[PDB]
Amino acid sequence: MAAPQFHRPSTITADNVRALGMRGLVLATNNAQFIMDNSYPHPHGTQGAVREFLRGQAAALTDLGVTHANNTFAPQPMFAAEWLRPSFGLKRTYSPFVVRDPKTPST
Amino acid sequence: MAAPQFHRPSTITADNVRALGMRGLVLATNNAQFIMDNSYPHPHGTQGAVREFLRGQAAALTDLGVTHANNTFAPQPMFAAEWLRPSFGLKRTYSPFVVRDPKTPST
Amino acid sequence: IRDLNPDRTPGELPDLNVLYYNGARLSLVADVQQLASVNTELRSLVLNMVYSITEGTTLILTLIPRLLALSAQDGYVNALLQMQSVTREAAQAPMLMQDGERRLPLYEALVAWLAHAGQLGDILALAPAVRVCTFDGAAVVQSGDMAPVIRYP
Amino acid sequence: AAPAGPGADMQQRFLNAWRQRLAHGRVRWVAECQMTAEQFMQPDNANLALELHPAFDFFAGVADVELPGGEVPPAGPGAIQATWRVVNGNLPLALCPVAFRDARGLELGVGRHAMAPATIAAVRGAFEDRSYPAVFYLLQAAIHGSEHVFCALARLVTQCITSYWNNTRCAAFVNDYSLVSYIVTYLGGDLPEECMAVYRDLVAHVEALAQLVDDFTLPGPELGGQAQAELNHLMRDPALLPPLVWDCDGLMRHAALDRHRDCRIDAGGHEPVYAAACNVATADFNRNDGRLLHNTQARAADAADDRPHRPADWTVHHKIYYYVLVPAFSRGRCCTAGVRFDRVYATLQNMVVPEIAPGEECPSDPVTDPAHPLHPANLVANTVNAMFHNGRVVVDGPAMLTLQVLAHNMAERTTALLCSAAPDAGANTASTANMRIFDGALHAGVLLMAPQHLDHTIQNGEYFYVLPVHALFAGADHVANAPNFPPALRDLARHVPLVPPALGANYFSSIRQPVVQHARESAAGENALTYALMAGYFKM
Amino acid sequence: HVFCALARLVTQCITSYWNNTRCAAFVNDYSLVSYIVTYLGGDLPEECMAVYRDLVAHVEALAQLVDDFTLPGPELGGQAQAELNHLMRDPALLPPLVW
Amino acid sequence: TQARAADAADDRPHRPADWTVHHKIYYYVLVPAFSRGRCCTAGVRFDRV
Amino acid sequence: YLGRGAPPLLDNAAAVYLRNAVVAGNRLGPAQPLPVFGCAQVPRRAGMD
Prior knowledge:
part of a larger assembly; 7 chains; C: mainly alpha; two-stranded antiparallel sheet; 4 strands; about 35% helix; D: mainly alpha; 3-stranded antiparallel beta sheet; Capsid triplex subunit 2 (chain C); Major capsid protein (chain F); host nucleus (chains A, B); Small capsomere-interacting protein (chains A, B)
């Protein structure tokens, strides 16, 4: 990244790295200045084509996926892969999934 | 069955058999792997045409029919054979049934 | 001949018994075929079509892919190749082997083909000895009329 | 063709058998695209020379082959032969235009019953529905067209009907006539009258057509045992039986006729035979003795082997509902199918029904309480309430708890049945004495309204297989999308209704191609088309 | 896949938008629309579901309009008759947006 | 685009032929009907979405 | 199809299919195909009025 580069998970520049969470990423990234190259004198080796961010910001939501809109043990996610589920074999086989979404844990 | 065969009621392969709650069935069958012949080196004598399953899975619901949607002593099944009942002799005979559904128990 | 194979393939063959001259479907008589009569006709057909093949002929067989190139970009040469053309199915090459280079096998291949294969109507059947000529200037001869006739074409 | 082995691959056994001499050539019955003065011109009707008599079809088949035999004809020299056009609907559309043929539906239609514009919007919406929930095919197959099981599940049904009615305004089970005849009989109590009418009017219209035969029939004795209306109209003729027959009652009467030849049913033995009932101990799902279950009876104690259960008009209304109405409603897009019952029940009774807590009320709403079987807690892969959910159908615990009847009644397989018959005495003479009319039908079948291949939840063709019986029912998108479908036939199957001759052929059927093209091509209404199509079924 | 996963988020989008304005939402994509009718047929008010259900039923009425004006015949250069007749059947042209 | 993550496709295509046929029909026949010339394709900035 | 002036369709199966679809029953369309040298042979019908 710009400033002091790291990609997930690191922190300076694109405020944070993967697993930072709802706040400090969003809050962090919101938090930075206009400048370019702060805290750093060099670019990403790959280039800045890869700043290893959305990968951390996406894996952040997977970490936030655990307790939001439901306690976790509560009735979330509602419809309850499986935004609305799928059906496997008529049984008599006993295992494997034939509908894109076999199930989504309700938690 | 595949793996270690039994038909109702047994358990390995088509998770469960007769004497097993829809659960552990449903949960059990859901529970198995892709493989074929696990825990076993031989096929069903009949063949696998009969794995003695739906027979156990159907007789499972008859065992689950007792306390669901009603305490058992509670007001279930609602319409309360006899999804909505039938009429016998005008009496003056005193026994026997005049309709497919003479009666169903509300329990 | 085809009857003589004898066509293995099913029992429904092509017509070959029916012609057209101008309009006027002409239906030949299909009745008997005799061994000896078909043999000689087959014998001399087979015999002559062989002698029409020479060394220079292979130089011509090179040109089949070139013909079908013309099958398709000229309206003539399109017509030339009959729909039921084996040549069309024959495409679905010099071979070095030139004996000192001064023979002219093309020319010699034409002469050879022209003699034996060119003259097949004549050997299979009797060649014309007469040709219609009308002095009065009537330019056809109706069927049943008398055709003034003059020596060989 | 002779039906061969299992009915499941019988169509797959067809496409592969019929791929070289099917896709290559051009089917003879393309006269549907022709106008008149196109048929009468020397050119490209080159089959004109074979249009000779009103009442017969002259076509080129193979020569020596006795028809009901073989997978594919050992093609020899082609011969040329006649087969008696059964109904007058079979005359080609070029010689009896749709625009004529529909003008005399309006003629018969005036003065008689008319389905309301409401009942047509609901019934048509069902056949046109992609999102039609799969539970209804299963329940229909679970009921297996029996009156006993219907009243058993009766409350489960009205929760399915109403929920579907509330989601999408359409009638639910219209793909089955029996159900619709029960939905009116028993379920008349609990249903909003808006959707009760759709069934009440749909059933009242089958009878309005049924009596139209009696107006145009004069009195007279019985001829060859058949009545006069059977010698007049096809829906009365009992020789022909509907494509989907839940019992043996149909074959009961047709087995005994001077016309009946021999039902050729593919199973262990060519000659059929009956089964009184079926249970968990009786059922053998994969078997081939050539046997049929006779069990639709409402009365489990009164069974039948010989004597048929229902009246004669029972079968007549199914003939009129399936052939007259459905063609009118779908417009040729729908397909029969068989059932894998081993696979059906397995997900029919696989269920999580919450054990009630002591003194706790029956949960109404799946959204809130976990004690309701449709709450996300109880939703399991492979189970049945996941299927009630995929379909947004609201059903409570006890209703799907009554599903346990499936132990008492079941079906092993669907039995694809080919039966022939002669022209009726009254229409039989020495030239036509050897003419057979080969008409097949499924034993326990289901009519699949709108194709739903587009969704990966259910594996392609799990519970059902296409097996088009009659050319009236072959979905262009049902057959093309069968699991192994030759890619060479992708387009050829768009125009041509592929029906395996194991189930009967166009020329040898009672309802031939011009009736099929009339149904989908006609621009008339649904009522008018119903009579015009009803009037094409009179005999020649 | 990504649709059926997110299918719940979408039904609220379609519905919410239908209430603010009576309009169909995702109409600019046919693949979505075809998914909307296929998968989402349950949860949507029937007034707006009709829009998608009819919009899809109309595309298929046009598709079969080609089969009327074509006659049977072999394949010519690998294309079937309907593709040689009409453009929409003709493969060579592919739609402007192909995921 | 396969909804089955178990079986990918290297060579063989996923869908039937009619799928892409309805999109031509939808995009070319219908949308011009509804928009009357007013619309535009666009590229997506995915990293930015 | 009585005259040959025109370069044909470059797919033979496409050309010879279109030809005998048109030429099939035409009054004019030649009885048997065009020879290189010869007369195009328009059929003559058994009677006229």
